[model samples]
Target: GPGSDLGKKLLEAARAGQDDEVRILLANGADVNTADETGFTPLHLAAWEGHLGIVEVLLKNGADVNANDERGHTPLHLAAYTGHLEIVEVLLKNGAGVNATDVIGTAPLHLAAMWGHLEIVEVLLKNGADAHARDKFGKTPKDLAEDNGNEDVARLAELAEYAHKASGSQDDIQKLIRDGALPELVRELSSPNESHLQMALWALSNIASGGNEQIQAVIDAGALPALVQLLSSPNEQILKEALEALVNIASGGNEQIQAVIDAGALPALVQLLSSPNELILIRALQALSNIASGGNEQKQAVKEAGALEKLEQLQSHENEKIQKEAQEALEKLQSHGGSGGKAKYK
Candidate 1:
């Protein structure tokens, strides 16, 4: 929001890490939050330039603490994602949202887990961030740890889970979700720890999706609804695991699918296809493929729920594997449209 010359000079100096020039612009009443065409504020440039001094000056002069660039990432998210601890601290001190996920639903914890930034993960957890939060594709931070082979991060969740073992961990798995332990347990499923996620999922499934006997407690507490909510989270790792679960359950057959669907899981699965993670998109397509192989009545039900459009997008995806599987699934679904959208379920 400055004259052209002021805009050019300010951006150039900030990009070049020229502290004095930045000071001059600020002193002359320049707006610290002015963004370029791509929504990069001068401070965004300064942060990207790795100039602590310039970043400090801008913050002191009232820069937008959490101004997101065009990619929907605050400077703090960028700093945290890129492993810039000092900048993360500076932003945190200035009250940045440490838990924000980027456009693909990646948070600092996901970034940390993805990159093995254990220190950054520690920083985020201590700040009260949920490691188990899923992204748009329903992946949690621990799922990223699983994907990245970070066993230590996964073990940390196990430790936390063990701590709660004596306090009635599996016992509370049956109760309806409330504001207390159930929700708290739901949050645990989003942790950077795999054991917590597995345990959480088992608890939820044991109660909601477990067959007539509830023999193994196959899923954890809050795992089902958490998976449902994860489709809309800003954490990709969360989405991936949720997608994996959908693939597993649906591939197992209608009893499993119906179990989850009746418990409010179908809507979440439907939402999973909209995520950007390739593996998730593929897995979700696979799950839909399984459902498409069901009876004609089921196909009609799925169409009524908008599964057809998602499948079409999946079939047309740029990934060759996704394209093949999705196309195959669509062929099966439409062929059975002759049967009123139903397919034979084995």
Candidate 2:
């Protein structure tokens, strides 16, 4: 306890950004882990003060990277809350807890996002921070960011959540859509990462599964062109998901069907009819059937795409379901075009 005087000096020097004095104090037997009356350790003070050198010095002297103050605010939390990106990096490199919750269950990510520190948020997420962590008030980092009007941070948080979960609940998907996640999801469709591409398609298909409003949301986000482009992917999984998403969109109404047709999807849909995979053939047929159910122009678009010959060929396929679908699609194509109004089809 006699060394408390030295401890006080160490804390003061660290908080004051006195790098050389901190090193001197540590060498003179001052406790690097020493805390003031409020449990703010030297490392916490340095982190909160944005003293990168002192933070590194304290860590080198065995400071606890995860040490929390009385309010459970760790050095990482302070660094994040105060927008000290370098100190946050140093603390994390020293094994700071990326997801450490403060007294109110607020993680460093929550603080970083709340304060609109996008770079720090990115760093935290890259280090495996949980964007979905709920605080005492049941507020996720995204919730806090949105509440504080940090749209960009909130969007990144939401995307990080999707990157981790790859899927959301029905309500969660709708909420995400309302939160303007469509544009971001649409952008991810072009991601170089296959997993990212798959997740984007999964989210789009689920969004498209909703009513016309939801389907329209996907279309307005410019997903149709990307979805149609993905139909020609060499990767069967991507191709199938893209097909499924388009099928859902096409089922919304004639306008949606027309949108799909306008996006240059007919050729791909017709091409996929000859796929060896029955599931691909089935989705291809479903897409064509929905398109054929649209107005005369829409049906003619499908016919002109040369889908009729494929449909007739599919009518004799081994799978009875495929044959039935092909027959129905053929009939829809051959029938008189319905009114060009917004007609809903099954």
Candidate 3:
């Protein structure tokens, strides 16, 4: 595709952003879409060089917006990656493939996201680029953004997926976890805003219900401590949701249970025994019950957290369900050799 001297000259002028030479060559019957030795057309060169004027001349002369290079990168892909927002819009307006993947399966959205161009990512998403689309190595744009520490663009990628979902907010949570937004969500858990904390805890609870990989992801993000801190939240809904998340995470396995224990979750959870809310007491006990079932060490952790004495006091309380759950937890703690604490209830 590199035979014509005029086409090669046009490619050079476009790459160099020489608008006058580009116009002269194109007006002289040069092929606007002519490929060099590497299959890079004049339009690809112009877009990659951030040359809007040269790009306009080529596009007006019928340059193929979606023409591919040796590596399958189009002018639109180059424009998006280079953060040329207007050039990207122009290419898209001229019918560029927003979802076109290069030879390596990297889409323009993927390039935009990986490069931390939030506006470019937004432009691509609004133009209907698939954020969930994976590359040759199976990494999505969200994954790329995270790997590059581009948190803002990563969120935009998640929002793109969130835009088309038909499920409830809980499903949005699942997508966030699956798309590697756990760190951000976990960060939101500590927000002073009760509403934000509650929503974050809700999503974390759902993630805890996922498989071991998801549980491990939460653990790997160092989220256990923030989640443990949520057990002490002033908001009642926050407390309940945090307890539910602990219940699911504790049920994952011994390591997850031990991780919860190591994060001072046992003490924070024990602090909830003083809450007057019956539903709060019920879920807390249920969570403690799940933790106490994690074998002798976890049972020992709960026992040492002073849960048994509290349960002994609750056993005589008015609510039958609270009494029931408390009794169950006490039985498990006693089985783990937790018989002789202060026993204030006794």
Candidate 4:
């Protein structure tokens, strides 16, 4: 008797949202964890039908909250996908696995994000959902949110990712770098969602902050051209992140600086000097200064892009830091008198 008559009646009562009958069946020896031919326990049916009362009755009667149907969908997955916020909360509070994946490797957060259930996504993330978990298609919760045009969910997902990375040690970062996370991140730089764009740029900036080898990995991933393109973005945050990443890459020395220059970033960097945002202005100056510190030829490129004139103007700017940075760049431009080759500095 895989499913006894009492279990069949209990399943029907749960699916029909009959809270009273469900409780009566449980009181009369119906199995709380009974499964029909599809392996759906009573809790799964109640959750899928949005029967909050019946769900509570089943859970109270000892129904397995984490029980999976034939396709590996848990109660939380159905509630999240169906937008039953309260049901989702109850399941999570009762210790449903927040990161449980289905046959397609989709988690509750993935379904919530994919279906634009903002409140559910927030709850899932707050309950320790892994925003970076990927489905069989290799798409993260953030990716699915972005693909579905759910901007708010996408932003939340990005924040979860940021929070996770922020708390991670440098060793964790190196591990990800060695695990070949750069190519995927670089590909995200071209995403249509601004949140995705910002997250990708932020991750790249952090990766570029590592030692020369890590910076070189970012460069080798073909991030330079895309980063340079982000400079022209109307979004201030995108501009700032792109500039930060370039500044880090430019810090790597002659060959890296040459890559920035060869990627047609010089004009954009020079133009960003005129940005009204003080932070953007400072970062743009820093990138130019790093590039100017390269070889005589590199310095000449920075100078030829009309950077010298802007640096000259910024020398008398109100902000002391800007004034000092502008002066330092000018000095770098004039220090060696444009010698024909690279200069050695320690």
Best by lDDT: 4
- True-vs-predicted CA distance for residue 302, candidate 1, Å: 66
Model 2 scores worst on lDDT over the 10 consecutive residues at 337-346
Off by over 4 Å in 4: 1-115, 118-167, 336-346
lDDT of 4 at 235: 92
Candidate 3's TM-score? 0.50
Per-residue alpha-carbon lDDT of candidate 4 for residues 1-346, written as tens digits (9 for 90 to 100): 5658999999999999988899898999999999988888889989989999998888887889999888999999999999999999999888899999999999999999999998898788778888899889899999998999998898768756853673367786777767776787788888887766866787788777766787788899999999999898999988988888898888887899999999999999999888889999988888888888888889899988999899999977899989988888888899753232221111
lDDT for model 4, please. 0.85
Tell me the spans in candidate 3 whose CA falls farther than 4 Å from its real position: 167-346
Give the per-residue Cα lDDT of candidate 1 at 1: 50
Q: How do the residues 49-165 of candidate 1 rate in per-residue lDDT, one tens digit apiece? A: 678888899999898988887788778766666777787778788888878877888777777777676666666765756656789999877788878898777655433333333
Question: Could you tell me every candidate's TM-score relative to the true structure?
Answer: 0.46, 0.56, 0.50, 0.57
User: Predictions ranked by TM-score, top down?
Assistant: 4, 2, 3, 1
Q: Identify the runs in model 1 with alpha carbons over 4 angstroms from their true place.
A: 1-3, 157-346
Per-residue CA lDDT of model 3 for 95-176, tens digit only, reads 9999998888999988888899887887787687886898889999999999999987776566455433312355554666
lDDT value, residue 64 of candidate 4? 91
